[PDB]
Coordinates of C-alpha atoms and ligand atoms in Angstrom, one line a residue:
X209 CA 82.2 48.4 -84.4
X210 CA 80.6 45.1 -84.0
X211 CA 77.2 45.3 -82.4
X212 CA 78.2 42.2 -80.3
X213 CA 81.3 40.2 -79.5
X214 CA 80.9 36.5 -78.1
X215 CA 83.0 34.3 -75.9
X216 CA 81.4 31.1 -76.9
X217 CA 79.4 30.6 -73.5
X218 CA 75.9 29.7 -74.5
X219 CA 72.6 31.7 -74.0
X220 CA 71.1 29.5 -71.5
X221 CA 67.5 29.2 -70.0
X222 CA 66.7 29.6 -66.3
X223 CA 64.0 26.6 -66.2
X224 CA 62.3 24.2 -68.5
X225 CA 61.3 25.6 -71.9
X226 CA 58.1 24.5 -73.8
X227 CA 58.1 25.0 -77.6
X228 CA 54.9 23.0 -78.6
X229 CA 51.2 24.0 -78.0
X230 CA 49.8 21.4 -75.5
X231 CA 46.9 19.3 -76.7
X232 CA 44.4 20.7 -74.3
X233 CA 40.5 20.6 -74.6
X234 CA 39.9 24.4 -74.0
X235 CA 42.6 25.4 -76.5
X236 CA 41.4 22.8 -78.8
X237 CA 37.9 24.4 -78.9
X238 CA 39.6 27.5 -80.3
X239 CA 42.3 26.1 -82.6
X240 CA 42.6 22.4 -83.8
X241 CA 45.9 22.7 -85.8
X242 CA 48.0 22.7 -82.6
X243 CA 51.0 21.5 -84.6
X244 CA 51.4 24.7 -86.4
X245 CA 51.7 26.7 -83.1
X246 CA 55.1 27.1 -81.6
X247 CA 57.1 29.0 -79.0
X248 CA 60.6 30.2 -79.4
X249 CA 63.3 28.9 -77.0
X250 CA 66.9 29.2 -76.3
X251 CA 67.5 26.4 -78.5
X252 CA 67.4 28.7 -81.5
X253 CA 69.5 31.5 -79.7
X254 CA 72.5 30.9 -81.8
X255 CA 70.6 31.5 -85.1
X256 CA 69.5 34.9 -83.6
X257 CA 73.1 35.7 -82.5
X258 CA 74.2 35.3 -86.2
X259 CA 71.5 37.6 -87.5
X260 CA 72.0 40.5 -84.8
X261 CA 75.9 40.5 -84.8
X262 CA 77.5 42.7 -87.7
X263 CA 79.7 45.8 -88.1
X264 CA 78.2 49.2 -88.3
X265 CA 79.3 51.7 -90.7
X266 CA 77.6 55.1 -90.0
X267 CA 78.2 58.3 -92.0
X268 CA 76.5 61.5 -90.8
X269 CA 75.8 64.6 -92.9
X270 CA 74.4 68.1 -92.7
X271 CA 70.8 67.1 -93.0
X272 CA 71.3 64.8 -89.8
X273 CA 72.9 67.7 -87.9
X274 CA 70.3 70.1 -88.8
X275 CA 67.5 67.8 -87.6
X276 CA 69.3 67.2 -84.5
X277 CA 69.7 70.8 -83.6
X278 CA 65.8 71.2 -84.4
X279 CA 65.1 68.3 -82.0
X280 CA 67.3 69.6 -79.2
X281 CA 65.6 73.1 -79.5
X282 CA 62.3 71.5 -78.6
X283 CA 63.7 69.1 -75.8
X284 CA 65.2 72.6 -74.2
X285 CA 61.5 73.4 -73.2
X286 CA 61.2 70.3 -71.0
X287 CA 61.4 70.3 -67.2
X288 CA 61.9 66.9 -65.7
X289 CA 61.4 65.6 -62.1
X290 CA 63.5 63.1 -60.2
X291 CA 61.1 60.2 -58.9
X292 CA 61.4 59.5 -55.1
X293 CA 62.2 55.8 -54.3
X294 CA 58.7 55.2 -53.2
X295 CA 57.4 56.4 -56.6
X296 CA 59.9 54.2 -58.5
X297 CA 59.1 51.3 -56.4
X298 CA 55.4 51.5 -57.2
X299 CA 56.2 51.4 -60.8
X300 CA 57.9 48.0 -60.6
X301 CA 55.8 45.1 -61.9
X302 CA 54.8 42.5 -59.2
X303 CA 56.5 39.7 -61.2
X304 CA 59.6 41.7 -62.3
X305 CA 62.9 39.6 -62.3
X306 CA 64.4 39.3 -58.8
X307 CA 67.7 40.8 -57.9
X308 CA 70.9 38.9 -57.6
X309 CA 71.2 40.7 -54.2
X310 CA 68.7 38.9 -52.2
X311 CA 65.3 40.5 -52.7
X312 CA 62.6 40.4 -55.3
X313 CA 60.0 42.6 -56.9
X314 CA 57.6 42.1 -54.0
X315 CA 60.1 43.3 -51.6
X316 CA 60.7 46.5 -53.8
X317 CA 56.8 47.1 -54.0
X318 CA 56.5 46.8 -50.1
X319 CA 59.6 49.0 -49.7
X320 CA 61.3 46.3 -47.5
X321 CA 64.5 47.5 -45.8
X322 CA 66.7 45.3 -47.8
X323 CA 65.4 46.5 -51.2
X324 CA 65.4 50.2 -50.1
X325 CA 68.9 49.9 -48.8
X326 CA 70.1 48.2 -51.8
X327 CA 68.4 50.7 -54.4
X328 CA 70.0 53.5 -52.1
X329 CA 73.5 52.1 -52.6
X330 CA 72.9 51.5 -56.4
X331 CA 71.9 55.2 -56.7
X332 CA 75.0 56.5 -54.9
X333 CA 77.1 54.3 -57.1
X334 CA 75.6 55.9 -60.2
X335 CA 76.3 59.3 -58.6
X336 CA 79.9 58.5 -57.7
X337 CA 81.0 56.1 -60.5
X338 CA 81.0 57.3 -64.1
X339 CA 82.9 54.5 -65.7
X340 CA 82.4 50.9 -64.5
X341 CA 80.4 48.9 -66.9
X342 CA 77.2 47.7 -65.4
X343 CA 76.4 43.9 -65.8
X344 CA 73.6 42.7 -67.9
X345 CA 71.8 39.3 -68.2
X346 CA 71.1 38.1 -71.8
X347 CA 68.1 35.7 -72.2
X348 CA 66.2 34.1 -75.2
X349 CA 62.7 35.5 -75.2
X350 CA 59.8 33.0 -75.3
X351 CA 57.3 34.1 -78.0
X352 CA 54.4 32.2 -79.7
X353 CA 54.0 32.2 -83.4
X354 CA 52.3 30.1 -86.3
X355 CA 54.5 28.2 -88.8
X356 CA 55.5 29.8 -92.1
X357 CA 60.4 28.9 -87.6
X358 CA 61.6 32.3 -86.4
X359 CA 64.7 32.0 -83.9
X360 CA 64.1 33.6 -80.3
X361 CA 64.6 37.2 -79.8
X362 CA 67.2 38.3 -77.3
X363 CA 66.6 40.2 -74.3
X364 CA 69.3 42.2 -72.5
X365 CA 68.5 43.8 -68.9
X366 CA 70.4 45.1 -65.8
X367 CA 69.8 44.1 -62.2
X368 CA 66.4 45.1 -60.5
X369 CA 68.2 47.7 -58.3
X370 CA 69.4 49.4 -61.5
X371 CA 66.0 49.3 -63.0
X372 CA 64.5 51.1 -60.0
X373 CA 67.3 53.8 -60.3
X374 CA 66.7 54.2 -63.9
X375 CA 63.0 55.0 -63.0
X376 CA 64.0 57.7 -60.4
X377 CA 66.4 59.4 -63.1
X378 CA 64.5 58.9 -66.3
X379 CA 61.0 57.9 -65.8
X380 CA 59.6 61.6 -66.1
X381 CA 62.2 62.2 -69.3
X382 CA 60.9 59.3 -71.2
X383 CA 57.5 60.0 -70.6
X384 CA 57.3 63.7 -71.4
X385 CA 60.4 64.5 -73.8
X386 CA 59.2 62.5 -76.8
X387 CA 56.0 64.5 -77.5
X388 CA 57.8 67.8 -76.6
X389 CA 60.2 66.8 -79.5
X390 CA 58.3 65.0 -82.2
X391 CA 54.9 66.6 -81.5
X392 CA 52.0 64.8 -83.5
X393 CA 54.5 62.3 -85.0
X394 CA 55.0 60.5 -81.5
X395 CA 52.7 57.4 -81.9
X396 CA 52.6 56.6 -78.2
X397 CA 50.4 59.6 -77.3
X398 CA 47.4 58.0 -79.2
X399 CA 44.6 55.6 -78.3
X400 CA 43.8 53.4 -81.3
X401 CA 40.7 55.7 -82.2
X402 CA 43.2 58.6 -82.2
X403 CA 45.8 56.8 -84.4
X404 CA 43.4 55.9 -86.9
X405 CA 42.1 59.6 -86.8
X406 CA 45.8 60.8 -87.1
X407 CA 46.5 58.5 -90.1
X408 CA 43.3 59.3 -91.9
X409 CA 43.5 63.2 -91.4
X410 CA 47.2 63.1 -92.5
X411 CA 46.4 61.0 -95.6
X412 CA 43.5 63.5 -96.6
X413 CA 45.6 66.7 -95.8
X414 CA 47.9 66.0 -98.8
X415 CA 46.9 67.2 -102.3
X416 CA 48.1 63.9 -103.7
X417 CA 49.3 61.4 -100.9
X418 CA 51.9 58.9 -101.0
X419 CA 52.8 56.6 -98.1
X420 CA 55.2 54.0 -97.0
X421 CA 56.3 52.0 -94.0
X422 CA 60.2 51.6 -93.4
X423 CA 61.2 48.5 -91.8
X424 CA 64.8 48.6 -90.4
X425 CA 66.4 45.0 -90.1
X426 CA 67.3 44.2 -86.5
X427 CA 67.0 47.9 -85.4
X428 CA 68.6 47.6 -81.9
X429 CA 71.7 46.2 -83.6
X430 CA 71.9 49.1 -86.0
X431 CA 72.0 51.6 -83.0
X432 CA 75.5 52.9 -82.5
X433 CA 77.4 54.3 -79.6
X434 CA 77.3 57.6 -81.4
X435 CA 73.3 57.3 -81.6
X436 CA 73.2 56.5 -77.9
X437 CA 75.4 59.6 -77.0
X438 CA 73.2 61.7 -79.3
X439 CA 70.1 60.6 -77.6
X440 CA 71.8 61.5 -74.1
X441 CA 72.6 65.0 -75.7
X442 CA 68.7 65.4 -76.2
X443 CA 67.9 64.2 -72.7
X444 CA 70.5 66.7 -71.4
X445 CA 68.6 69.7 -72.8
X446 CA 65.9 69.1 -70.1
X447 CA 65.9 71.1 -66.8
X448 CA 67.2 68.3 -64.3
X449 CA 68.0 68.0 -60.7
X450 CA 71.8 67.7 -60.6
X451 CA 71.7 63.9 -59.2
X452 CA 69.4 63.1 -62.3
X453 CA 71.8 64.8 -64.7
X454 CA 74.8 62.8 -63.1
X455 CA 72.8 59.4 -63.2
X456 CA 71.7 60.0 -66.8
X457 CA 75.5 60.8 -67.6
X458 CA 76.7 57.5 -65.7
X459 CA 73.8 55.3 -67.0
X460 CA 74.7 56.4 -70.6
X461 CA 78.3 55.5 -70.2
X462 CA 78.0 52.4 -68.2
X463 CA 74.9 51.0 -69.4
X464 CA 73.2 52.3 -72.5
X465 CA 76.1 52.5 -74.9
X466 CA 77.1 48.9 -74.2
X467 CA 78.5 46.5 -71.7
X468 CA 79.3 42.9 -70.5
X469 CA 76.8 40.2 -71.1
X470 CA 76.2 37.5 -68.6
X471 CA 74.1 34.2 -69.1
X472 CA 71.6 32.8 -66.5
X473 CA 74.3 30.4 -65.0
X474 CA 76.6 33.5 -64.5
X475 CA 78.9 33.0 -67.2
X476 CA 80.6 35.8 -69.1
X477 CA 78.8 35.7 -72.6
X478 CA 80.1 38.5 -74.5
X479 CA 80.1 42.3 -75.0
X480 CA 77.4 44.5 -76.6
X481 CA 78.0 47.8 -78.4
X482 CA 74.3 48.6 -79.4
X483 CA 70.9 49.1 -77.7
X484 CA 69.9 46.9 -74.9
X485 CA 66.3 45.7 -75.2
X486 CA 65.6 45.5 -71.6
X487 CA 66.3 49.1 -70.3
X488 CA 64.0 52.1 -69.5
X489 CA 65.1 54.3 -72.5
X490 CA 64.8 51.6 -75.3
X491 CA 61.4 52.8 -76.4
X492 CA 62.1 56.5 -76.2
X493 CA 65.6 56.2 -77.5
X494 CA 64.5 54.0 -80.6
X495 CA 61.7 56.5 -81.3
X496 CA 64.1 59.5 -81.3
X497 CA 66.7 57.8 -83.3
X498 CA 64.2 56.5 -85.9
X499 CA 62.5 60.0 -86.2
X500 CA 66.1 61.7 -86.3
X501 CA 67.2 59.4 -89.2
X502 CA 64.0 59.4 -91.1
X503 CA 63.5 63.3 -91.0
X504 CA 67.1 63.8 -92.2
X505 CA 66.6 61.0 -94.9
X506 CA 63.4 62.6 -96.2
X507 CA 65.3 66.0 -96.7
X508 CA 68.4 64.0 -98.3
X509 CA 65.7 62.1 -100.7
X510 CA 63.7 65.4 -101.5
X511 CA 60.5 63.9 -100.3
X512 CA 57.9 66.6 -100.2
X513 CA 55.9 67.5 -97.0
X514 CA 56.8 64.4 -94.9
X515 CA 54.6 63.5 -92.0
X516 CA 55.9 60.7 -89.9
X517 CA 54.2 58.6 -87.4
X518 CA 56.9 56.7 -85.2
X519 CA 56.6 54.2 -82.4
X520 CA 60.0 52.8 -81.4
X521 CA 61.4 51.3 -84.6
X522 CA 58.1 51.3 -86.4
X523 CA 58.0 53.9 -88.9
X524 CA 55.3 55.2 -91.4
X525 CA 55.8 58.1 -93.6
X526 CA 53.1 60.0 -95.5
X527 CA 53.9 62.7 -98.0
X528 CA 53.2 64.8 -101.0
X529 CA 53.5 62.7 -104.3
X530 CA 55.8 64.1 -107.1
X531 CA 54.6 61.5 -109.6
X532 CA 55.0 57.6 -109.7
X533 CA 58.6 57.6 -111.2
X534 CA 59.7 60.6 -109.2
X535 CA 58.4 58.8 -105.9
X536 CA 60.1 55.5 -106.7
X537 CA 63.6 57.2 -107.2
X538 CA 62.9 59.5 -104.1
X539 CA 62.1 56.2 -102.0
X540 CA 65.5 54.7 -103.2
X541 CA 67.3 57.9 -102.3
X542 CA 65.4 57.7 -98.7
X543 CA 66.7 54.1 -98.2
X544 CA 70.4 54.9 -99.3
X545 CA 70.4 58.0 -96.7
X546 CA 68.9 55.6 -93.9
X547 CA 71.5 52.9 -94.9
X548 CA 74.4 55.7 -94.5
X549 CA 72.8 56.6 -91.1
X550 CA 73.0 52.8 -90.0
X551 CA 69.4 51.9 -90.5
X552 CA 69.4 49.5 -93.5
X553 CA 65.9 48.0 -94.7
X554 CA 64.9 44.6 -94.1
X555 CA 62.1 44.6 -96.9
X556 CA 62.8 47.4 -99.4
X557 CA 60.1 50.1 -99.0
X558 CA 57.2 50.3 -101.6
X559 CA 55.3 53.5 -102.4
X560 CA 51.7 53.3 -101.7
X561 CA 48.7 55.4 -103.2
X562 CA 45.9 53.9 -101.0
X563 CA 46.2 54.4 -97.1
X564 CA 44.4 50.7 -96.4
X565 CA 47.4 49.2 -98.3
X566 CA 49.9 50.4 -95.7
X567 CA 50.9 48.1 -92.8
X568 CA 52.3 50.1 -89.8
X569 CA 52.7 48.7 -86.2
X570 CA 51.5 45.4 -87.9
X571 CA 48.1 46.9 -88.6
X572 CA 46.1 48.5 -91.6
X573 CA 43.2 51.0 -91.6
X574 CA 40.0 49.2 -92.8
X575 CA 36.3 50.6 -93.1
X576 CA 33.1 49.2 -91.6
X577 CA 29.7 51.0 -91.0
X578 CA 27.9 51.8 -87.7
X579 CA 24.3 51.4 -86.6
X580 CA 23.3 54.5 -88.7
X581 CA 25.2 53.1 -91.7
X582 CA 27.9 55.7 -91.5
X583 CA 31.5 54.8 -92.6
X584 CA 33.9 54.1 -89.5
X585 CA 37.5 53.8 -90.0
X586 CA 39.3 51.3 -87.6
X587 CA 42.6 49.4 -87.2
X588 CA 42.8 45.7 -87.8
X589 CA 45.7 43.2 -88.6
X590 CA 45.9 39.6 -89.7
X591 CA 44.8 37.5 -86.9
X592 CA 47.0 34.6 -87.2
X593 CA 49.5 35.6 -84.2
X594 CA 46.8 36.9 -81.9
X595 CA 44.9 33.7 -82.4
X596 CA 47.9 31.3 -81.9
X597 CA 48.9 33.2 -78.8
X598 CA 45.3 33.1 -77.4
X599 CA 45.4 29.3 -78.0
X600 CA 48.7 29.1 -75.9
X601 CA 47.4 31.2 -73.2
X602 CA 44.4 29.1 -72.9
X603 CA 46.3 25.9 -72.4
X604 CA 49.0 27.5 -70.2
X605 CA 48.8 30.3 -67.5
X606 CA 51.2 33.0 -68.7
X607 CA 52.1 36.1 -66.7
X608 CA 51.0 38.6 -69.6
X609 CA 47.8 37.9 -71.5
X610 CA 48.1 38.9 -75.1
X611 CA 44.3 38.0 -75.8
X612 CA 43.2 40.7 -73.2
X613 CA 45.6 43.2 -74.7
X614 CA 44.3 42.2 -78.2
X615 CA 40.6 42.6 -77.3
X616 CA 41.3 46.2 -75.8
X617 CA 43.4 47.4 -78.8
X618 CA 41.5 45.5 -81.5
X619 CA 38.0 45.7 -79.9
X620 CA 36.2 47.0 -83.2
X621 CA 37.5 44.2 -85.4
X622 CA 35.3 41.3 -86.5
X623 CA 38.2 38.7 -85.2
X624 CA 38.4 40.3 -81.7
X625 CA 34.4 40.5 -81.1
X626 CA 33.5 37.2 -82.8
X627 CA 36.4 34.9 -81.7
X628 CA 38.4 36.3 -78.8
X629 CA 35.5 37.9 -76.7
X630 CA 33.3 34.8 -77.3
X631 CA 36.1 32.4 -76.3
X632 CA 37.4 34.0 -73.3
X633 CA 34.0 35.2 -71.8
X634 CA 32.8 31.5 -72.3
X635 CA 35.8 30.0 -70.3
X636 CA 35.7 32.8 -67.7
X637 CA 32.1 32.6 -67.0
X638 CA 32.3 28.8 -66.5
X639 CA 35.1 29.3 -64.1
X640 CA 33.5 32.2 -62.3
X641 CA 36.6 34.2 -62.9
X642 CA 35.0 37.4 -64.9
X643 CA 35.8 39.4 -61.8
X644 CA 39.4 38.3 -61.5
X645 CA 42.1 41.0 -62.5
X646 CA 44.5 39.6 -65.2
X647 CA 47.6 41.3 -66.3
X648 CA 48.0 42.8 -70.0
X649 CA 50.4 45.3 -71.6
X650 CA 49.5 48.4 -73.5
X651 CA 52.4 50.2 -75.2
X652 CA 54.9 48.0 -73.3
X653 CA 53.5 49.0 -69.8
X654 CA 51.7 46.4 -67.6
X655 CA 48.2 46.9 -66.4
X656 CA 46.1 44.6 -64.0
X657 CA 42.3 44.6 -65.8
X658 CA 39.1 42.7 -64.9
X659 CA 37.3 41.3 -68.0
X660 CA 34.1 42.8 -66.4
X661 CA 35.4 46.4 -66.9
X662 CA 36.0 45.8 -70.7
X663 CA 32.7 47.6 -72.1
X664 CA 33.6 50.9 -70.6
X665 CA 37.3 50.7 -71.4
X666 CA 36.4 49.9 -75.0
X667 CA 34.0 52.7 -75.2
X668 CA 36.7 55.0 -74.1
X669 CA 39.3 53.8 -76.5
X670 CA 37.2 53.2 -79.5
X671 CA 33.6 54.8 -78.9
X672 CA 30.3 53.1 -78.9
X673 CA 30.8 52.2 -82.5
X674 CA 33.0 49.5 -81.5
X675 CA 29.8 47.7 -80.3
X676 CA 27.8 48.5 -83.5
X677 CA 30.1 47.8 -86.4
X678 CA 28.7 45.7 -89.3
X679 CA 29.2 45.3 -93.2
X680 CA 32.9 44.8 -92.7
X681 CA 35.1 44.9 -96.0
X682 CA 35.1 41.8 -98.2
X683 CA 39.0 42.0 -98.0
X684 CA 38.8 41.9 -94.1
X685 CA 36.3 39.1 -94.0
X686 CA 38.2 36.9 -96.4
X687 CA 41.4 37.4 -94.5
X688 CA 39.7 36.3 -91.2
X689 CA 37.9 33.4 -93.0
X690 CA 41.2 32.2 -94.6
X691 CA 43.2 32.3 -91.4
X692 CA 40.5 30.3 -89.5
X693 CA 40.8 27.5 -92.2
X694 CA 44.7 27.6 -91.9
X695 CA 44.7 27.1 -88.2
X696 CA 41.8 24.8 -87.7
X697 CA 39.7 27.5 -85.9
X698 CA 35.7 26.8 -86.2
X699 CA 34.1 28.9 -88.6
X700 CA 32.2 32.3 -87.9
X701 CA 28.9 30.6 -87.8
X702 CA 30.1 28.5 -84.8
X703 CA 31.3 31.6 -83.0
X704 CA 27.9 33.4 -83.5
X705 CA 26.2 30.1 -81.8
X706 CA 28.6 30.3 -79.0
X707 CA 28.3 34.0 -78.5
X708 CA 24.6 33.8 -78.3
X709 CA 24.9 31.2 -75.5
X710 CA 27.4 33.2 -73.3
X711 CA 25.4 36.3 -74.0
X712 CA 22.3 34.8 -72.6
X713 CA 24.3 33.5 -69.5
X714 CA 25.9 37.1 -69.0
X715 CA 22.6 38.9 -69.2
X716 CA 21.0 36.3 -66.5
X717 CA 23.7 37.3 -64.0
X718 CA 22.8 41.0 -64.0
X719 CA 25.2 43.7 -62.9
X720 CA 28.4 44.1 -64.7
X721 CA 28.0 40.6 -66.4
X722 CA 24.9 41.9 -67.9
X723 CA 26.7 45.1 -69.2
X724 CA 29.1 42.7 -71.0
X725 CA 26.3 40.7 -72.4
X726 CA 24.4 43.8 -73.8
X727 CA 27.5 45.9 -75.1
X728 CA 30.1 43.1 -76.1
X729 CA 27.5 40.6 -77.7
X730 CA 24.7 42.9 -79.4
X731 CA 26.2 41.8 -82.8
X732 CA 25.1 38.3 -82.0
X733 CA 21.3 38.8 -82.0
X734 CA 18.8 40.6 -84.5
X735 CA 16.7 42.0 -81.4
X736 CA 19.5 44.7 -80.6
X737 CA 19.5 46.1 -76.9
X738 CA 19.7 49.9 -76.9
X739 CA 23.4 51.0 -76.4
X740 CA 23.9 54.3 -74.5
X741 CA 27.1 55.9 -72.9
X742 CA 28.1 53.6 -69.9
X743 CA 28.2 55.7 -66.7
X744 CA 31.6 54.1 -65.6
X745 CA 33.3 55.3 -68.8
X746 CA 33.5 58.9 -67.9
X747 CA 34.6 57.9 -64.3
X748 CA 37.6 55.8 -65.8
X749 CA 41.0 57.2 -65.0
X750 CA 43.0 56.5 -68.2
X751 CA 45.9 58.7 -67.3
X752 CA 49.3 56.9 -68.3
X753 CA 47.6 54.7 -70.9
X754 CA 48.5 56.7 -74.0
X755 CA 51.4 58.9 -73.1
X756 CA 54.5 57.0 -73.9
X757 CA 56.0 53.6 -75.0
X758 CA 57.7 51.5 -72.4
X759 CA 58.7 48.3 -74.2
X760 CA 61.4 46.6 -72.1
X761 CA 61.3 49.4 -69.6
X762 CA 59.8 47.0 -66.7
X763 CA 56.8 49.5 -66.1
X764 CA 53.6 48.8 -64.1
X765 CA 50.9 51.3 -64.4
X766 CA 48.1 49.8 -62.2
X767 CA 47.3 51.5 -58.8
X768 CA 49.6 50.7 -55.6
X769 CA 47.7 49.3 -52.5
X770 CA 48.3 51.7 -49.5
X771 CA 50.3 50.6 -46.3
Ligands
LIG148 N1 54.5 46.3 -83.6 C1 54.7 47.5 -83.0 C2 53.5 48.2 -82.3 C3 53.8 49.3 -81.5 C4 52.7 50.1 -80.8 N2 51.4 49.3 -80.6 C5 51.4 48.3 -79.7 C6 52.6 48.1 -78.7 O1 52.5 46.6 -78.1 O2 53.4 48.7 -78.2 C7 50.1 47.8 -79.7 N3 49.6 46.8 -78.8 C8 49.6 47.2 -77.4 O3 49.7 48.2 -76.8 N4 49.1 46.1 -76.5 C9 49.1 44.7 -77.1 C10 48.7 43.8 -76.3 S1 48.5 42.3 -77.3 C11 48.8 43.3 -78.7 C12 49.1 44.5 -78.5 C13 49.4 45.5 -79.3 O4 49.5 45.5 -80.6 C14 49.3 48.6 -80.6 C15 48.0 48.4 -81.2 C16 47.9 49.3 -82.2 C17 46.4 49.4 -82.7 F1 46.4 49.0 -84.2 F2 45.6 48.4 -82.4 F3 46.0 50.7 -82.7 C18 48.7 50.3 -82.7 C19 50.0 50.3 -82.2 C20 50.4 49.5 -81.2 C21 55.0 49.9 -81.7 C22 56.0 49.4 -82.3 N5 55.9 48.1 -83.0

């Protein structure tokens, strides 16, 4: 069947759209080549529609069926709870898209009578009605990139009332089932330090390792109605409350398998027969589907001792080599099996014999040295996209701050420490906003974080070595330096000068600012301050941070204020 059918109505914006980076003094201090930075808009939506619209041909075999049964036997150990309305309302982001039924995200979080009444009625409708397709809105996503232009990605989501009901029925399932099924292969259970540890240990556990990343082109579009029903068959192995079992059954048939598409003007836009990017099950379902297809394909290809690391559609495979010619033919057989399963590649996969040459979740393992000179492995990436997005976020207030999420996840990197920490701490200190909570996302979930709490968060996610790394690899240094020339970012010597200045001001303020000065900026001086475990680090409640993926799932994980 076709992934989409279109009526001809356009994918429309709901307000004015900006595509060009503004010429602003604060963003210009970071990045001077503003014309290289752009944001996608609904103007390129038709280009994206063409790429995501195609017929799927799926052929399943015995390897696929055997893997499915093994996955279902693991899912059969799970007991999942139904969330109460209050618990589901607390998980709603403060700025989640308002309902078309006269209430918004603030009303949901406050348990307003109108919000609660509508949610109760949507819930009863899922219990009673197993067939009526649920309406979805289709919008073009606004994302920032550097030139060499990508068309806008498309987001498809149901009304706010439906989203709260999805959490009641499935929040506990999507949060616990993936690790029960995939074990150590489920990527979202790891902090960045645990992810590097798993990759390094897996690589070194093989007698002769071979690894590859597998990129599926337009993954959401490759997901069939059969894949979505198979995903439900896994969820159905859980012990569930009867209302949850009915709501999952109704959500699968009325929403997850497909449905009508409506634009921002209320016009009928088309029909979807593939994965919706903006539903609670998107990350869990994509992870399960990608793992199932890859595990079965590994057996069809005769790849030896395949260890997967899966995060939604992102897949990395580490296995036992059989020699270069054998591995090359086995990888082609893996690709042919994935294609039969309706997961064709974007870029054809390449066998790799060095762990540092593999790119997974846009990142690669690199090496630096700690204070004692000991080798430390860490995850880095090309800093182009993070710097272009940090420049945009400096010139325009955006709801989600990728710069903050990049500092958290990429804290040990030369670019996050020297550029991002230096730039944002300087601006925030000058605006007296170091203590102001800002939103960021970790594995798709939204968090409200104060920049002053960064040292203890970094210590927990990466260890104290994140504040002591030096002697970065020449390859890493060259990649950063070349990206700065390309974007017109001032050189690292300038960032070291700016860091010494903000560090002195942070130290002069005492308290939490001085902890930021001491730990975050120790790299900028020869006269190093002594770095001991931060007391607040052991008291940090990071439950929920690295449990599961929630991209498109409309999840908020920061504490709810009492009433
Ligand atoms: N492409 C992907 C990435 C992922 C998982 N994922 C995400 C994510 O946004 O979900 C990261 N991440 C965040 O969780 N918050 C963020 C805020 S701004 C940038 C990120 C970011 O990269 C992230 C960082 C790393 C590390 F390498 F750092 F370990 C590894 C995997 C990561 C799965 C599938 N495709």
